[PDB]
């Protein structure tokens, strides 16, 4: 079941040694444990999620989200509704 609340940034997007990105998100909604809504948009990209299907284990919990973002300009959407978090990423 999908999370339906506010997800704030705990630690910002960062490139890893193994050429991937990681975000650490705090979940501020209810219904937790729940699947974290993750969208990778281009300038909708499929199967670029490295992490094992991310979940918000409890409210106030932090979650590591490993992605393989496309080259260049990409947009990561964490969550749903007007509380969704759109993140702009650039990959060289």
């Amino acid at each position, epitope marked *: 079941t999908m999370c339906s609340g506010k997800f704030s940034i705990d630690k910002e997007m*960062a490139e890893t040694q*193994h050429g991937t990105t990681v975000v650490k998100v705090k979940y501020e909604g209810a219904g937790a444990p729940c699947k974290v809504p993750i969208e990778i948009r281009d300038v909708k990209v499929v199967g670029r999620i490295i992490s094992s299907t991310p979940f918000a284990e409890y409210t106030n919990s932090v979650t590591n989200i490993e992605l393989e973002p496309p080259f260049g300009d990409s947009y990561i959407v964490i969550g749903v509704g007007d509380s969704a978090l759109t993140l702009h990423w650039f990959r060289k």
Partner: antibody
Amino acid sequence: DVQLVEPGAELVQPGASVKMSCKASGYTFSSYWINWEKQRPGKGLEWIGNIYPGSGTVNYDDKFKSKATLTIDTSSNTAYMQLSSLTSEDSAVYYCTRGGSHAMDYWGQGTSVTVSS
Amino acid sequence: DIVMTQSQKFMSTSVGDRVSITCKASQNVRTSVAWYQQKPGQSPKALIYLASNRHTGVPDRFTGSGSGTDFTLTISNVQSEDLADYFCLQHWTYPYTFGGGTKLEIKR
């Protein structure tokens, strides 16, 4: 010519903390990740975690979260690992290495830490 | 966490013979597998990067093969200097995990 200079050995008291250095040279330091590994005698290798000079980006292996602190001094091209509240489980050979998407390539000489009063 | 299973703990080979050091991944790590040579009382030396690619200044005796879960390091024409500890490492995802190690003995 890549060179990661690591002090040979360090004698630490139980419960005390140690700061060990890894002096890089021979390459663009601020453009490669630094790795740190643990090697207990007759036992295998363990990945402590990694640092990125050109951003200060850190990744730790949860096993070492409360134990290791990875700092970097770009002005001295030295990478550091601080191990805290030492126990005999911490007596091991600590390595530092250059990182990339090819991983470890050039390993330093390793500090042989010994925990005893 | 991914577990690198280097089953071969000890291996004896006469100079000139062929040896195949196996490594098994707990899950699909793709090709993000490196091999290292650790000669007694020395730092590990990088041999193979990304499962099959030999590093600079590594003899063509050293060969890497495989993908996913089965990875092998092959040393054809064994030399007296080849006397070391050999290990695989995954860098597919954090935390980076190492093979058990394989102490290669040289038969004489």
